[PDB]
Design a protein around this ligand. Structure first.
Ligand SMILES: [Zn+2]
Ligand SMILES: [Zn+2]
Ligand SMILES: [Zn+2]
Lengths: 149, 46, 1097, 50, 66, 50
RNA sequence: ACAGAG
């Protein structure tokens, strides 16, 4: 029921744990992607019913399985020789619990993501920080003695 | 190879081929929805 | 000393919304129609009788409505949900079944269920499938639990019979004429005949005018026609004051000039003035007994009770000419509202009478002539007289009934599904009586009679300002009562009959009349005991609780209005400075021991009326009560309607701002309902991530707005930034729009039908036309699946086909031509679903549902929920924003120059209340005339470390150095409006032209082009630009050349003047085409525009 | 350059003057009501008593 | 329709805190305690969970299912 | 909607455009920013010379 | 024919 554009947008904002000093920029065009300048994840979730279900049948956690697509169902697919440049567990989405879609039995999601390298000025899904800011340091001073009550 | 349509109420495959009045084979519901395409489509994550 | 206060007094309003008000008005009128009025119309038309060949009759016995059905192809019948009737483009009706009794020689043959017609069943009425269901059973019908209902479904679209606003019938309007004279008139309307009578004083003597008389006859001759022959009794019935007799004298002096002294003479005088449709006497006596003042009844040609009424009219004219107390039409004691049931009653009565007349015509054709075998009329009950009448009168919007001379237009509108408020706001609209004839400025104002009955601010802005209105939150519209016990009670309370006295008792100082809907019930002394005893009999449960009573002490009348279609409002009774509702009663209501009807029965809450709250004295709050107060207002935020109940702190704003929000709040992008995905509409706008408001009115909780909202919480600094925010423009944030703020969806529609004709041939869809060179379909057929229909999930570019249709051109083998449905549009679109269904006539219906995601840009109109509407002007990055000490940099910078000349303080308090309510997890109420105060939200900011007035220390983002003034941060609930720039950009270089006038077409969909108006011609002349005015209005529209004969001045062709039969005087002239169109429309009119040309030096 | 609810709030210098001015105006209007209803009102030239 | 992944104003990842927010309202918290136990300091992150309506749980009830 | 008010004194023209407006002070007081989608459609006949 | 918008 989540649309395709909204699903692509929600997958656009999930942060990736890959170090961006090792990759390079994808050139203008170059729609395939090579070993140097991209990654590739694969989400595939099929939602069915539960073969054992109680007579009350109230909560969706008992009646169904894989009805909440989290970001832990993202599975990395290497390209070229990237299987040795990164050990098993350093290329993954970060927060392990981000809800993407939500399913009902008979509905299926399969897709193929292509991570690349980009600056934050282009789009706000490349910003490395939640928020970065500063303030000056205060110096409250007491001009006269404040005593008692 | 045949055109399989999805029924609206009972969600079952029907395969309407001959020139017939449109009706589900299993229920009496008379509205079909086409299935999704099998060709891939590309979206930008913006 | 303070009067003690009941604090839970508000809880009567959620008890009131269980039963009455808030589209339950439409439901209680449609159920009233299909449960009593369809029996009462059938009762008065129970028998048809053939003229020739008697002892033959068709007798109707009982009528029904029943459950909704569909009639499919192979005669199988099944019930149906309203959403299946939405998708397949069919009506949602139920068959009218009637049992009869007719004669075929054998004198008694009866039936049980003869289907004669199909009644469109309104949603959530008594015969709909949706009533009495649980919210988990609306899921199996594809219907929302919050969809209000009250609308019809006719041929696929949703149509609403709107509330009309009409003046009250059977009432003496004393008004001024155009020339300054004061007369009276009463539109004597009953169920059978409507007609207006007048009273003109054109010479100082009284005349009566009517649409039947060819001349206005004086009133004393009418009195002498109605059985009172003495002049003394006439002057008694008029009045016994000195100036009244002085004003009436020159009418007796006119009557004695003619020889009219006798009743038969007066009737012979009237009969010589009747426009013709025993003549002289009887066509005047039947006239005065059936048409003039036709609501005042004459029993057996006894004209006493009509003489008293017309003398009351003449006396009111005489008294109103002295002091100019004309009655205003705009007082809402005189307005009546007509719901959907009272229009469908008139429509079905006219259709049923035309059905009986057509059946009597068929009966008189086939009884005297054909055959001794007795026919039955069951073989002539054609169903398509009633069904198509109902569906065509609902779907088109006109109710042209010839019997009642009703010629209304524009009653039904398409129910707007822009947001949730737009569907609920349309079900409370009241169209007005005048309907935009001229700039009246008299009923377009806000009269004080609309207190609590209609909404102050909720009106459209433009040509219909004040002529389209909206009901309040706590109102109710009455229906027609049984009229039984009111007369039987009034006859036992001191009302003398009017027949037992002369006219002199009417002019006494201590004698008041009593009326019941226009008829005089007699006179009475001691009217206060009558009014108080009648109100006690209304409170004690004997008289029905909507029967109002009033007292016009100037005109000396005690009105009683049992009629239907007038506005009521509940109140709390106050007896000797204490409210009748205690804290114990509201605790008993909250625990569930009682309901609102128990408040009605125990004389605690009584319904008032606009005529009845002219007598009473009402206090707003409990500390306004003094000794002369009879009622207490329940809730003063019920003064505001439904669409103004979204505004927070709406009493701090200026009054046009609430009106502009009542206009913008029906256009905000949001969510329609819970079935917004299984729904295929012509146009549907959704928002991606909606959020419920942070500062909310109690009206929002009462209509369940925050279960499906329209808008998003924007963090808003109020400062001047970058100079692109000068007049109402607002600067967004590039890193907030990328994260999902303001993201919207646009769904459209594309339907295609495939019909089978009368000749046994059919439309058909071919497959995708392959290219043999590359074994792929061509680019214009790229997205087609093998069934010729576009498939869900693929992108649709411009001018690619969706349905590859082919129809026969029959105008032996079929000759097909291609007629495809092609996607026209500026940008690309996706497909979500393709629907396929069929009707019973072997027609196939295909509906697609397209989809576009639009991201906000320069040109998209946002709103503010206070009337501070504005387009976007600049989208800056997150780095160029100003920022706080905590790192919050705002999304929408707003210009502070909107606030002084518009005086919206409600936005300045919504911001502060939302900021103080997000820091500790509350929703601070912005309820009208109350809500969370300023002193309680200033103390929740200081507890969490912020400033007590919202103003925050801001380090800037361009320079890095702090700003001098403090900037005012907080969340404001901004809603996105439907006016986007991608659907308003338009540009025509040259394209398709019209056929008659060779100049470009009308609108954006036709690639139309813009218009040099009649006023922009007046501006190019002021500059003196002559060749620019020539280039715009001749060269770039319709430049053209004509063969002008210089000899005679006519127009030739190809150098050949067919008039002169010569070719030596033709010439070519630079002319516009709409002038050459003019020079040949006029030669057909025999107005010949003979030109004379000269050389062009 | 910003605006706020503290830019339109009345201080203590206004909430004492407003009360006295409202009381003076209400008492003078009550005196003119009482002088119209129960006797002599010094009528302005060219108008009625109301 | 569903909880957004990032807060709109700053950019903190909010869209994994929703199932924990309802779970901390199962255990009888006030909302000001749950938003502090999830770690939301600034108020722009607090309005993402505090003002969110869960329409997908009730739009999926009308979705087609076997 | 007659000839003399609808098709003669004022008539529908081409080479025109209608779009929502929005402020911009970085232009001069005698300039206007035409979008690219309108500037590709609205053309001008430029006669060729030396 | 109706609703909008400025
Ligand atoms: Zn089925
Ligand atoms: Zn000639
Ligand atoms: Zn945040």
């Amino acid at each position: 029921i989540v649309q395709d554009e909204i699903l692509a947008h929600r997958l656009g904002l999930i942060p990736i744990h890959a170090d961006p000093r090792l990759f390079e920029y994808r050139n203008q065009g170059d729609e395939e992607g090579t070993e140097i300048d991209t990654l590739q994840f694969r989400l595939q979730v099929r939602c069915t019913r539960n073969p054992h279900a109680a007579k009350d049948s109230s909560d969706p956690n008992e009646l169904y399985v894989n009805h909440k697509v989290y970001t832990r169902h993202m599975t990395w697919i290497p390209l070229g020789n990237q299987a040795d440049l990164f050990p098993e567990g350093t290329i993954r989405p970060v927060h392990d619990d981000i809800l993407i879609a939500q399913l009902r039995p008979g509905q299926e999601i399969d897709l193929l993501m292509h991570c690349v390298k980009g600056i934050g000025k282009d789009h706000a899904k490349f910003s490395p920080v939640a928020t970065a800011s500063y303030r000056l340091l205060p110096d409250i001073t007491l001009l006269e003695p404040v005593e008692g009550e | 190879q045949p055109m399989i349509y999805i029924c609206g109420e009972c969600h079952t495959e029907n395969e309407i081929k001959s020139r017939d009045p449109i009706r589900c084979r299993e229920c009496g519901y008379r509205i079909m929805y086409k299935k999704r395409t099998k060709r891939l489509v590309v979206f930008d994550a913006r | 000393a303070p009067i003690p206060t009941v604090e839970e007094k508000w809880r009567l309003l959620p008890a009131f919304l269980k039963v009455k008000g808030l589209v339950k008005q439409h439901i209680d009128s449609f159920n009233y129609f299909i449960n009593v009025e369809i029996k009462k119309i059938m009762k008065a038309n129970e028998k048809v009788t053939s003229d020739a060949d008697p002892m033959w009759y068709l007798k109707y016995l009982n009528i029904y409505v029943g459950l909704p059905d569909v009639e499919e192809s192979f005669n199988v019948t099944r019930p149906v949900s309203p959403h299946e009737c939405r998708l397949r483009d069919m009506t949602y009706s139920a068959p009218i079944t009637v049992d009869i009794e007719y004669t075929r020689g054998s004198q008694r043959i009866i039936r049980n269920a003869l289907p004669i017609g199909r009644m469109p069943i309104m949603l959530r009425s008594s015969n709909c499938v949706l009533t009495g269901k649980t919210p988990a059973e609306f899921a199996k019908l594809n219907e929302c639990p919050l969809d209000p209902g009250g609308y019809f479904i006719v041929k696929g679209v949703e149509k609403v019979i709107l509330i009309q606003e009409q003046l009250s019938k059977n009432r003496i309007i004393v008004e001024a004429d155009r020339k300054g004279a004061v007369g009276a008139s009463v539109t004597s309307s009953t169920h059978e005949k409507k007609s207006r009578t007048n009273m003109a004083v054109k010479q100082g003597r009284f005349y009566l005018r009517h649409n039947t008389l060819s001349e206005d006859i004086p009133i004393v001759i009418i009195f002498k026609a109605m059985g009172v022959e003495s002049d003394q009794e006439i002057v008694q019935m008029i009045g016994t004051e000195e100036h009244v007799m002085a004003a009436f004298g020159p009418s007796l002096e006119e009557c004695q000039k003619a020889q009219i002294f006798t009743q038969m003479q007066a009737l012979k005088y009237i009969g010589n003035k009747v426009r013709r449709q025993k003549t002289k006497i009887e066509e005047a006596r039947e006239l005065l007994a059936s048409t003039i003042l036709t609501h005042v009844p004459v029993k057996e040609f006894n004209f006493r009770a009509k003489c008293i009424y017309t003398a009351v009219m003449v006396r009111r004219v005489i008294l109103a000419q002295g002091d100019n107390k004309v009655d205003d039409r705009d007082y809402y004691g005189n307005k009546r509202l007509e719901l959907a049931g009272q229009l469908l009653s008139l429509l079905f009565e006219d259709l049923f009478k035309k059905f009986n007349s057509e059946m009597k015509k068929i009966a008189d054709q086939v009884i005297p002539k054909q055959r001794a075998a007795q026919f039955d009329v069951v073989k002539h009950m054609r169903q398509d007289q009633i069904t198509n009448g109902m569906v065509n009168a609902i779907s088109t919007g006109n109710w042209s009934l010839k019997r009642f001379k009703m010629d209304r237009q524009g009653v039904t509108q398409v129910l707007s599904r822009l947001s949730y408020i737009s569907a609920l706001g349309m079900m409370t609209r009241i169209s007005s009586q005048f309907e935009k004839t001229r700039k009246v400025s008299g009923p377009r104002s806000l009269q004080p009679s609309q207190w609590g009955m209609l909404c102050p601010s909720d009106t459209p802005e433009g040509e219909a300002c004040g002529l389209v209105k909206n009901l309040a939150l706590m109102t109710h519209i009455t229906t027609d009562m049984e009229d039984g016990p009111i007369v039987k009670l009034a006859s036992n309370l001191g009302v003398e009959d009017v027949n037992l006295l002369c006219g002199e008792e009417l002019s006494y100082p201590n004698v008041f009349l009593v009326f019941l809907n226009g008829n005089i019930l007699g006179v009475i002394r001691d009217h206060k005991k009558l009014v108080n005893t009648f109100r006690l009999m209304r409170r004690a449960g004997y008289i029905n609780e909507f029967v109002s009573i009033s007292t016009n002490l100037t005109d000396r009348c005690v009105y009683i209005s049992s009629d239907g279609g007038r506005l009521c409002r509940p109140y709390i009774i106050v007896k000797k400075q204490k409210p009748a509702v205690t804290n114990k009663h509201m605790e008993e209501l909250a625990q569930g021991y009682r309901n609102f009807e128990d408040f009605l029965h125990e004389s605690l809450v009584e319904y008032l009326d606009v005529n009845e709250e002219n007598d009473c004295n009402i206090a707003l709050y409990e500390h306004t009560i003094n000794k002369d107060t009879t009622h207490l207002e329940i809730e003063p935020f019920t003064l505001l309607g439904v669409c103004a109940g979204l505004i927070p702190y709406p009493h701090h704003n200026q009054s046009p701002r609430n009106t502009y929000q009542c206009a913008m709040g029906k256009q905000a992008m949001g969510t329609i309902g819970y079935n917004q995905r299984n729904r295929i509409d012509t146009l549907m706008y959704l928002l991606a991530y909606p959020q419920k408001p942070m500062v909310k009115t109690k009206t929002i909780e009462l209509i369940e707005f925050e279960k499906l909202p329209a808008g998003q919480n924007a963090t808003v600094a109020v400062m001047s930034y970058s100079g692109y925010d000068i007049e109402d423009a607002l600067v967004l944030n590039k890193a907030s729009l990328d994260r999902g703020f303001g993201r919207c969806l646009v769904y459209k529609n594309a339907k295609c039908t495939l019909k089978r004709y009368t000749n046994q041939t059919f439309d058909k869809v071919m497959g995708p036309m392959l290219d043999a060179a590359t074994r792929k379909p061509i680019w214009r057929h790229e997205i087609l699946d093998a069934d010729g229909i576009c498939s869900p999930g693929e992108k649709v570019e411009n001018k690619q086909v969706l349905v590859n249709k082919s129809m026969p051109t029959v105008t032996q083998q079929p000759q097909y031509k291609d007629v495809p449905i092609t996607y026209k549009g500026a940008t690309d679109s996706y497909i979500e679903k393709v629907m396929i269904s069929s009707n019973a006539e072997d027609a196939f219906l295909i509906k697609m549902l397209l989809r576009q995601t639009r991201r906000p840009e320069i040109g998209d109109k946002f709103s503010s929920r206070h009337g501070q509407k504005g387009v976007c002007g600049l989208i800056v990055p997150q780095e160029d924003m100003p920022f706080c000490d905590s790192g919050i940099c705002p999304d929408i910078i707003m210009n502070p120059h909107g606030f002084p000349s518009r005086m919206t303080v409600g936005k300045l308090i919504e911001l502060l209340a939302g900021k103080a309510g997000v820091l500790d997890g509350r929703f601070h109420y912005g309820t009208a005339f109350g809500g969370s105060k300023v002193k309680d939200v200033c103390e929740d900011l200081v507890r969490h470390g912020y400033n007590y007035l919202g103003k925050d220390y801001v380090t800037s983002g361009i320079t890095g150095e702090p700003l001098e003034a403090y900037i005012y941060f907080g969340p404001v609930y901004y809603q996105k409006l439907k006016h986007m720039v991608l659907d308003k950009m338009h540009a025509r270089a040259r394209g398709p032209r019209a056929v008659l006038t060779r100049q470009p077409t009308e609108g954006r969909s036709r690639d139309g082009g813009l218009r040099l108006g009649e006023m922009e011609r007046d501006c190019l002349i002021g500059y003196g630009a002559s060749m620019l005015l020539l280039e715009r209005l001749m060269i770039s529209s319709d430049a053209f050349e004509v063969d002008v004969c210089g000899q005679c001045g006519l127009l030739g062709y190809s150098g050949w003047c067919h008039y002169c039969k010569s070719s030596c005087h033709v010439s070519s002239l630079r002319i516009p085409y709409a002038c050459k169109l003019l020079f040949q429309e006029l030669q057909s009119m025999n107005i010949i525009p003979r030109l004379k040309l000269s050389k062009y030096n | 350059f910003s605006i706020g609810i503290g830019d339109v709030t009345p201080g203590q210098g206004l909430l004492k003057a407003k009360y006295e001015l409202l009381n003076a105006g209400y008492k003078k209007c009550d005196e003119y009501i009482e002088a119209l209803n129960t006797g002599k009102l010094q009528q302005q030239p060219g108008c009625t008593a109301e | 329709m569903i909880i957004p992944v990032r807060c709109f104003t700053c950019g903190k990842i909010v869209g994994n805190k929703w199932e924990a927010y309802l779970g901390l309202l199962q255990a009888e918290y006030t909302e000001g305690d749950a938003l502090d136990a999830l770690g939301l300091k600034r108020y722009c992150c607090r309005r993402m969970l505090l003002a969110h309506v869960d329409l997908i749980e009730k739009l999926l009830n009308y979705a087609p299912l076997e | 909607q007659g000839r003399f008010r609808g098709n003669l004194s004022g008539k529908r023209v081409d080479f025109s455009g209608r779009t929502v407006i929005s402020p911009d002070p970085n232009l001069r007081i005698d300039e206007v920013a035409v979008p690219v989608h309108v500037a590709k459609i609205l053309t001008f006949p430029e006669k060729v010379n030396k």
